[model samples]
Target chain A: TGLFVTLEGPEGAGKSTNRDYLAERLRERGIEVQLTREPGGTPLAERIRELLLAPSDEPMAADTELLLMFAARAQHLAGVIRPALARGAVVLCDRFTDATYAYQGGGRGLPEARIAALESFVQGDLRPDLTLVFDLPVEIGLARAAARGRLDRFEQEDRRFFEAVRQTYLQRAAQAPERYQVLDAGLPLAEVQAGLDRLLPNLLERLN
Target chain B: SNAMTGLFVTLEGPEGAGKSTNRDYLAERLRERGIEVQLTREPGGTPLAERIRELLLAPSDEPMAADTELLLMFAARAQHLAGVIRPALARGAVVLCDRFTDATYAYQGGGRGLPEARIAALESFVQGDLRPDLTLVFDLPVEIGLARARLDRFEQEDRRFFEAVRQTYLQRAAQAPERYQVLDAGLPLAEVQAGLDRLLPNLLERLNG
Candidate 1:
């Protein structure tokens, strides 16, 4: 059977760097790991991501933004995630429905019920088996993100919104501690890796 | 003080509903009468919307979930309303759009077998208190509608798909007779134009009134 894993966090929480490390470790352990990201996976989903992230003069409605995210999710699930997972690959996805709950629901102030409705519609009963949520202070994450770049539409959001996003992720983890493994990204990099190292064996053992 | 101004009108129907030519004629007639009309189409009318329109109409081996299709329609619509329709209407220009939420009801709800209530949720989500002041629903037999056209992604559907689409329009018109005018699209071009003779006046009156 396939195991679905997701890595979620705010900007500069190092989801990409961590995802790479996790995939490498999984491969080292002879686990077939397929890595991908949300608002993208397949070509069509990637196109939707472009629309979702690109800056536009016209203001996007919360509902419209939410809908586009799910549209991309639908395409991604159909084109990539399901196939890899069905083939028994441990799919390590960067962000997922949790991002919708965080960004659209918590940050944008769209209703959680609306995001939940879409999650059910697009995903049915599908969910990540394990979610590694990198926790951090909003200002720190935003500053690190600022240092790295030309901010896209989402990265341009202010501190308060990102704070809300971070809180929501923490709230979700608190609500379901088993499914989520929350790590303090503020703690030095070694500690973050140590948390993952402790968490990975149990995850690996359960899967096998 | 005058923001509640422009008349929003939409043309709704399936592919072969004699839409393109009649829509052009409708716009020309409206313009001739000195009405400030902004003619446009759904999934389009802006650069961003036109891109979505291509995605919507393009044939693909990939199967788009009905919910995704519905959302994409509204995504384009959200941009279209934000960019073109709402602004044009606010300035008191008659916004005559080809297709709108009604098409979603027909295609995604009826033809694709999604529920009307779900599509309704989006209508309320994307368009809050806005609806067409007038809707011209071009009604025709499914066979006749499909026979005359080059089949796009929508038109490539089997007979049953078009049957549901046509019936949905017929039912919608019946339910809201006050807002919708069901036109016989199978009639000859001149006949169709003459049929609109009755409609165009009332619309002109509405626009200028």
Candidate 2:
């Protein structure tokens, strides 16, 4: 069996930085890691992401958002995850199914049941063995993101939207405590690293 | 007898009618009987065709228009039949498929209210002279069948949609009794297997003896 670990959080929660940090740490420890991100890991997925993120004159519909995301995901899974995992590589992904549940189901106010159904179709039964959710207040996270500079369409959503996203993440993390770890985004980077370090050995051991 | 020709066998049914399961079982049985059997399924089997299937089945994607769905299915069937099915059959292997034109007649024409004539015209254009020699229709009540189908994310559809499919399947079975076998899938597995055992010898004798 292959190990799939995903990092998820709101914008400006330092997910990218931490994902890089985690990859380096894992690499230094001699673990082979295939570090990747969603919606654009493969060529086809990247193309789909281009279509998704390209500035549109009109707002993309909720169904369009969901469809594009899954299209990219399907390509990503077929092109990247399945092949890498089959070859015995550890897949370190940034934002997988949880993001859809948060953004589409929670933020966009689409039916959660439909979102769940789409998730099942796209991901099948492939559940991440571990999901590290970097949690922060929506306002704080948005502020941090704004401070860092330019906001994408998703990041440009108002605080209320992101608040719903944050709540959705919390609810999902609560529902799957064993598989999800909600960490304080306000924690010092060193502490977060330490927490991951403490968590990794057991996870690796259990997985092995 | 067209020894150089191919033998195409299809399995059709509503959700939960065990079409896939029976397809696999029959393939294995054929192989055990010293026949070279290449088992495959539709809207897939080729890279491009599989992608088309993904688009068709993805819940988030726009619902495929009936004409588009029909065309895509036939396009996929054409590719599958040419790339995979035809080659195996050319080598004298038995080709067992999960669904075929009958599914379109049931799901698209019957269920979705597309004109059967239109679907038939599209089918002719895409898959001319490629009808299945044997089509196993796993007959079951729409309620129980749809219930079983719900286990898969793809199996979920509205009641009227499946009612249309069930109706078309019965009509097709009636129209082509010699080519189509309507198996009552509501029966227990042992009984179904017994029915097959009783049916197969004569069919095989007619085909191969």
Q: Which 10 residues in a row give candidate 1 chain B its minimum summed lDDT?
A: B143-152
TM-score of chain B of 1: 0.94
Chain A TM-score vs. truth, each candidate? 0.96, 0.94
Off by over 4 Å in 2: A147-151, B1-209
Instruction: Write the residue-wise lDDT of candidate 1 on A94-192 in tens digits.
Output: 999999999998999988887888888779899899999998997777666665546678977888899989999999999998899998989888889
lDDT of 2 at B119: 71
lDDT per prediction? 0.84, 0.75
Compose the digit string of candidate 2's lDDT tens values, residues B38-87: 78887787664565576557654333334445545665666676678877
Per-prediction TM-score: 0.90, 0.52
Where does model 2 sit among the CAPRI classes? incorrect
iRMS of every model, one decimal?
A: 2.0, 13.1
